[model samples]
Target: GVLTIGCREDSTTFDPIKSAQNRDTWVFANVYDTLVRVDNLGTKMEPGLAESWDISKDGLTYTFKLREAKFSDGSPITAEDAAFSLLRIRDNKASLWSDPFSLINTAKATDPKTLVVTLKTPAVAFLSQLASPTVSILSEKAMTKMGEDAYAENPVTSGAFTVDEWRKGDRVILKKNPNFWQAKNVSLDGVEWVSVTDDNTRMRMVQNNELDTAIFVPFSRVEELKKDKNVVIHSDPSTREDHLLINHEHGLLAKPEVRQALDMAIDKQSLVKTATYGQGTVAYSYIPKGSLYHYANNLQRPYDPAAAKKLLADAGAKDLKLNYVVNAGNEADEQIAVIIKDQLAKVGVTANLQKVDPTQSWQMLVDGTYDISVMYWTNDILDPDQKTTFVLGHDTNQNYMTRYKNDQVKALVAAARIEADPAKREQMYIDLQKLAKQDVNWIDLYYSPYINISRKNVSNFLQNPLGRFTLEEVVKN
Candidate 1:
């Protein structure tokens, strides 16, 4: 049966190496094959393009054995393509999601089926990083001849499904790939990712039988749908932290006291209840509450209206007024934005709320033009670097949208990246969260989930916390 999935955003590119956004990664899970595959829960790793791999005693080198496979075009896939894909991501410096590959010294294809990778440092998380969708093997022959831009429209991918049609703003259609290495195991005839930006509309489509599944369903709809026998809710919490992206350069925002007061003024428990309909968890740390890497400390900016008022007065910002941005159509952000305004007003701060398009809101944060905007950190990788150094690093990361640069934070984050000791690595993150608490670089909001719903006929539907789902074993009666 053909399965139709609803998405909140449309993919910008089909090139796995260029894929960065959670939306892109979700679709790429079906259309691309990485060196390794992350398990259904995003907790373990398994072989994908590389059937088996070995690491040197020094832990700086990795040797991979590629299983004989074919591309969607039915061309034989070799180790060269795998090496080329990794090198393409490493050297280009354009793959924003390829933060884990920064330690790679080189990747080489020694033979038809053997690929060797050398790292600048010993990183235990290296193997798990390879499972990222951006590290997927590509057809070097097809990409080189057609060029990256033209190839993006249609690439000879190496996954269970290939792009059949892309309707831009409407939807993306995929057809089962007969050339897939495990084609015999795939049950669905095809898949369609429908772009439904409106949460209510997407839910309506699922109820109307227009979509087999709908993701990112609004929290208000969750309780109502739970009683519907036709729908099955994917209720697990994801590794997505919905928070406020603050521009440190904005007036009065640079002061830590002001930041702390702003964070402490809001009631997170109430925010989670109203915004998520009690469907999400309150975040005390930067990491999503349900994630394995999450850690908490006394430095958390918990709700304290009395303390907040005093801090604002001490900061001499009693008359502070700031611009607050919320993406239109997001039920949670919009709902919480109002609550934040009410809470801030109680502490004698005026917040001017501005609604913009989802894409435009993100651009505002990246450009550091807005004082603050409601956003989510998508960390699906097993490594904590995605939400840690990747998002907050100064000199090391270009995706540091917060624009809060400091020498100490830079040195500390870099040290944690290459630490091979599991215990040491986690403690390092715990310390970093302590530092984040003091700096108040950004405010931590509640942990929001995708809260997807599928038709009852669909079974064996599996999804990981990284906002990706696989249809390989899904059966729709």
Candidate 2:
């Protein structure tokens, strides 16, 4: 029997590089392989196409031994192939992979089955980044076979699944690549993924047994499934923090009191109860729950209309109308916008819900257009640097959202990067978060855990915070 999972977004393409944040990217792990694979739990590293890796004493170079794997096109995988794939990412002018690959200085194939990577400086998580789906090893033959539009028409890989057919925006069909290195571990013969964006429609389908797995289940539907015998709810506070971003880069959010007042105006805990149905937890900082460095003892934001009023009054907030920009395709944005509007109004702050399409909204957020905006940050990797550098740190920010810059925090981020000792780096990240809390740069919300409801019959459908899926052990019930 074929397995089926429902995703909310309409996938644009199967290209992992361009659509790194897309849900359909998971299918690539079955089609491609990387040097180091994300473990089942997603917290640690595992052997993938690269059987073993060793770092040089100076920590500037890393060498890997390639595993004997091959693409669905029946071409053997080699270290030379891995080197070329990385170079392609580094050299690619219009690729998301290029930006991340810039972290590596250069890569070379030492031998047919051996590859060496040289970094300008020691990057602790370089291997982890390369092992990610974003840097999945593409087949030389597959690339040539498909050509310029290869990733679109026929996305082939070295994993347990290969694209059988793609019906763009309707459904994507994938069949097990029998030549896959780990085909025996695959449970179903193939899979069909449908894009059904509506929350009600997706939950209803899973509740009625029309689908085997339903992903991105909104907080609104959890209570409805509580009494259902056929459905199971698994929630892990994701490493991702759903929070607000203030772009002070422009003059919109520059006033410190305005930022603080905005933070005070909203009762995150109350929103957790009302908006998330108490299924979500409040976060004081950007750090998510259950991570190695996330401080669990940190206190959450308080719900005080009086304090919110005082802060706004002190800031001389007059005519307090502000535009709240949110991504258009999301349903949760509408829910959050209304809730925030009410919360702000109670504190004498008026907010207008301004919806913009993602194409426009993403650039607007980066350019610092709105007074305040809603956004989500799923940390890049398991390391604290994922949050500090990309999210909390002043530079190398994710699209530079929030448009914040802090010299002290910038020093901490740089220190965390170069500091060889793990304890020192961890402390640096902690200090960085403390500074962010003081500035009220962000209103830390709940960590959106990886939530997936699989059929009771499926043995071990793997779930991890790394945002990578391991179907190698997913056996049929």
Candidate 3:
């Protein structure tokens, strides 16, 4: 049986090290398996290729015992392959985990089944970091033979599926990996990941039985789809926070006064209600709820247009005009833009809505060419630093969108990495969040839940808060 999934975006690359976007992970998660995997909720770690691991007394060394697994090419997976994969990720500076993995002084195969990694300093998030799909282990021999560029296009993976074909900007066809360690769990014969960028198109595809599963279904379609016996909608609270990314280098948005005014002008509660139809909660801070260092108070800006206008007037930024970019075909984002546009106008700020393709919108943010763009972040690691420091750190701007840097914030982020003490680290994050509130570059918006709609025949289908899913157990009834 074949399962066809309707997705909103296309992956840029299949090489785990070169991949970062969650959309890419949606494909990689099925095509590759990491050394460790997160549980369904992404709140706990579970064994993957490595059956077990031990940490040294000094917390500097980690030794993992490999499980009996085979690559799609039918080669036995060994410790050496795991070591090589880690080093390859470390060597590639562009890898998303390069900075975090730099704590590794060296990784080596102590024995055929044992891999040892020594860190220069103890990283609290090391194990969780390894669980990331971006660090998925690769077949060393195949990688050496194929080379980086070729391997990315046609990878010899060790996951539940093998890449059959990739029609860029359209779909990726995958065939089941017969040699997958847990073959008994593999139910589907094949999977076709169809790229349907428009929200409405994805829902219609599922409604018309053109697709087996569709993700990010608009909440407006929930009641209507529920009335249809053919559809099943899976709604789960998410850690993803949606907000406007402000380019600090730009003239109007560079000023903190203007950013603050923009933040206060629009009501977050109303925005969430309008965009998600009362399905999401108002987000107030960078640290998402349910996180370890989440502030109880959730420092938030008061929604007062009068105060927003006064701040704009005080900064002499009155009548500020700026471009606001959103991904085209995202019905909710476009609607939110209209609400924000009206709200900002009340504070003498003019925001021109510019909707473009998802890929183009992300490129504009990376190039720092847009004034304000709608964006969201999904937390796979369940750490505040993953949501904050990783995006806004001084030396490491992983997203390339945050151009604002401060010595104080940078020092706090650097200190938080190696603090070692849980209580102390918690305080450090609290201090960072408090400091960020004052020097805000991006306004905190709302935390929205994920809405997935699928045909009633789709079974064993579930998605984590980060939007990662495994189809090994998905069956077409």
Q: Residue 383 error for model 2, in Å?
A: 1.5
**The best candidate in terms of TM-score:** 3
Name model 3 segments beyond 4 Å from true.
395-400
Candidate 1 per-residue C-alpha lDDT over 185-298 given as tens digits, one digit per residue, 9 for 90 to 100: 999989898988778888999999999997888899889898999899887647888777778887778788898899889888888888888887777778667565678553
lDDT of 3 at 56: 88
Instruction: Pull out the clashing pairs in model 2.
Output: 30-159, 31-157, 31-158, 238-448, 238-449, 457-477
Model 1, position 166: C-alpha lDDT score: 90
lDDT of 2 by residue, 1-477 (tens): 777777765556666666545455665656666788766666678888889999998898989998777777778877777887787766765465454456678788878789898987787867767666667777756676567466656776767788898877667788888877777667778877787766667777877788877777777776666566777666643566778877675453667777777787787877767767776677786667766567666645467778767766676664577888865545666678889998888887778888775435655765667877777766446666645655655543443377676777777766776678878767766676677777777777666676667667665665567655556666666
User: lDDT for every model?
Assistant: 0.80, 0.70, 0.81
Kindly indicate the candidate among 1 and 2 with the higher lDDT.
1
Off by over 4 Å in 2: 97-100, 141-149, 297-301, 304-316, 326-332, 355-371, 392-400, 407-411
Encode model 3's per-residue lDDT on 49-161: one tens digit a residue. Answer: 99999998899998999999999899988889889988877787657657666778999998878999989998777887777777788899998989888888788988999
What does the lDDT read for residue 345 in candidate 2? 88
The TM-scores, one per candidate, come to 0.95, 0.88, 0.96
Candidate 1, residue 332: Cα displacement in angstroms equals: 0.7
Clashes of each: 0, 6, 0
Candidate 1 vs. true structure, TM-score? 0.95
